[PDB]
Amino acid sequence: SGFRKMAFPSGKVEGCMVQVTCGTTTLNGLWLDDVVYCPRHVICTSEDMLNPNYEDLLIRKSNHNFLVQAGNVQLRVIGHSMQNCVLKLKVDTANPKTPKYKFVRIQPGQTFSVLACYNGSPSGVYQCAMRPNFTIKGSFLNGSCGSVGFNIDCVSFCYMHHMELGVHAGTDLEGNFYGPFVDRQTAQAAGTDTTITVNVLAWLYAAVINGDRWFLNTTLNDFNLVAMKYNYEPLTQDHVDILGPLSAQTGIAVLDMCASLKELLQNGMNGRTILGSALLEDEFTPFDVVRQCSGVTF
Amino acid sequence: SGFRKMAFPSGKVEGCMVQVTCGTTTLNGLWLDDVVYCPRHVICTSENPNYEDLLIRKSNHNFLVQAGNVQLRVIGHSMQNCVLKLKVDTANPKTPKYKFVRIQPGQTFSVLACYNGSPSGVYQCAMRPNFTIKGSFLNGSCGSVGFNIDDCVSFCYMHHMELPGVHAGTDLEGNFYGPFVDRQTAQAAGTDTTITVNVLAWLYAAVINGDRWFLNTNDNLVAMKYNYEPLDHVDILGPLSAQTGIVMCALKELLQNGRTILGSALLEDEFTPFDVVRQCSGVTF
Ligand SMILES: *C(=O)c1ncc(Br)cc1OCc1cc(Br)ccc1Cl
Ligand SMILES: *C(=O)c1ncc(Br)cc1OCc1cc(Br)ccc1Cl
């Protein structure tokens, strides 16, 4: 019973979070095996961030300029290299707490948990979606850079935080930004954002599963005309296929739930609520809904 | 910036979760030092328990405790209120510094939702004024715990039962929160009001993050009509008043008139003043 925005348990990620200092600049880094990953802007001074020349700033750095602490212990750095927008510090000890892990680039509309960190120490954990425009609506203060996002006994790291634009932007663990962003203190346009349609649909399924059925009353090509109108992502057959399991478990056909949603979009909610929300929620994937509704564990 | 319902990091609790089996009943237990804690209804079959009689028919070896692959050896069992305490022959080497704490209504904690001794997820809950919680709890989640962290984990909640709707449980001494008992009967939770001091803390969080529009001066008279907990609550809200230069209750206009605040089309009451400050200033653990 109940339905909650639920983060993954964070223990395996917590044992990977270290502090990285370079100059006055300090942020979080991710220690897996003998490599520490962090945003390359750890090397920028106050004046550098407006237009940093990362190649030329890194040239002025030596291994011993990088202070890496994993708790009270200090790691010694035996090599440094830049891969796109992430710095990779080789250190002489492999992390004993390294989990089984992969590095993944998620697709827009996919969700992950963020372990917000400061000075290499965890502060909290929360579930996020990658917006269609490759920003994320998170909770990130000064110093949170290098906090990571992930999905789970194997941790798939998908996101490292790099900058607050009120929305947030960063990279995969190969240092490639999500979206058009660059790592410089400039104004940068995020796209026109849209609602993640397949996720709203999944969340309506969760609603029906938990007893909220008041909204239950089209064609794919026709629903998409409505979706386009309300700045919703178009629905593809791939999305319909991924909604399969929930359609079977609940016994409502996906194009039927789509007619329900069209009505919600064209008519609003009349001050009613769905799963305790007065807006349509789009930060649950069809996997998340299934995960939670069936209690899968890690 | 930004503002999210944030759960505490769960690692220190994950190392404490175990599977407890009695008969053909399995749920979650909490292994700290040489003691495993779980709901005493682990000893109940499917067929109004007399727990003392049921426990009397149970011996130490009828309780199977697993920590991952390791199986612990029970060497003692007492019942304190509604918790079973199984003394095991092994202290948990992953026991964190910890306290047992009984929270007050309107306070918040993190739930590490678990099935068969294994972590499913973590989320932030508020103890509702009527001593239920609105969580996400399936059959099997019993024994999952609620907690706050300060290197010290304060356990405040053990899950005992899904009501028709919401959730109920105990403190780690086995005393239920609220008027509930560990029996499968219809049990009423009283009317549940809104946590006024929490909604105010959330409005400060909103102002800190730039949501300004809702700013427009006993007159509690309105709170009573809209079923809000009566507004000492000012003293707790002090530091937010000092940070923003704003005690705001004139929320009155919100209640009577009804756009979004911090991305919600509802007034939110599951952030305590402490939560807002922790989050808006980067408290770590
Ligand atoms: C970002 O989270 C962050 N935290 C701490 C510190 Br010392 C710096 C930092 O980044 C600042 C930043 C990065 C970028 Br790519 C663009 C603008 C800014 Cl202000
Ligand atoms: C509750 O979360 C739970 N999970 C798994 C199992 Br095997 C049993 C269980 O409790 C069932 C229960 C407890 C109570 Br105090 C009242 C009614 C019910 Cl159904």
Swiss-Prot record, chain B:
Consequence of changing residue 184 to A: Does not affect ability to cleave and inactivate human TRMT1
**Residues exposed to the Cytoplasmic side:** 1-285
Name the UniProt record assigns to this protein:
3C-like proteinase nsp5
The record places the active site at 41 (for 3cl-pro activity), 142 (nucleophile)
Q: Locate the cross-link: Glycyl lysine isopeptide (Lys-Gly) (interchain with G-Cter in ubiquitin).
A: 5, 87
| Reaction equation(s) it catalyzes | TSAVLQ-|-SGFRK-NH2 and SGVTFQ-|-GKFKK the two peptides corresponding to the two self-cleavage sites of the SARS 3C-like proteinase are the two most reactive peptide substrates. The enzyme exhibits a strong preference for substrates containing Gln at P1 position and Leu at P2 position
Where does the UniProt annotation locate this protein?
A: Host cytoplasm; Host Golgi apparatus; Host nucleus
What domain of life does the UniProt record list for this protein's source?
A: Viruses
Annotated effect of mutating residue 87 to R: In strain: Beta/B.1.351
Task: Provide the assembly information.
Answer: 3CL-PRO exists as monomer and homodimer. Only the homodimer shows catalytic activity. Interacts with host FBXO22; this interaction promotes the proteasomal degradation of nsp5.
Domain named Peptidase C30 is located at 1-285
Effect on the protein of changing residue 139 to A: Does not affect ability to cleave and inactivate human TRMT1
Q: What is the lineage of its organism?
A: Viruses, Riboviria, Orthornavirae, Pisuviricota, Pisoniviricetes
Function according to Swiss-Prot or TrEMBL: Cleaves the C-terminus of replicase polyprotein at 11 sites. Recognizes substrates containing the core sequence [ILMVF]-Q-|-[SGACN]. Cleaves and inactivates human TRMT1, preventing tRNA guanine(26)-dimethylation of tRNAs. May cleave human NLRP1 in lung epithelial cells, thereby activating the NLRP1 inflammasome pathway. May cleave human GSDMD, triggering alternative GSDME-mediated epithelial cell death upon activation of the NLRP1 inflammasome, which may enhance the release interleukins 1B, 6, 16 and 18. Also able to bind an ADP-ribose-1''-phosphate (ADRP).
Activity control summary: Inhibited by pyridone-containing alpha-ketoamides compounds 13a and 13b. In turn, alpha-ketoamide 13b (tert-butyl (1-((S)-1-(((S)-4-(benzylamino)-3,4-dioxo-1-((S)-2-oxopyrrolidin-3-yl)butan-2-yl)amino)-3-cyclopropyl-1-oxopropan-2-yl)-2-oxo-1,2-dihydropyridin-3-yl)carbamate) inhibits SARS-CoV-2 replication in human lung cells. Inhibited ex vivo by michael acceptor inhibitor N3. Inhibited ex vivo by compound 11a and 11b.
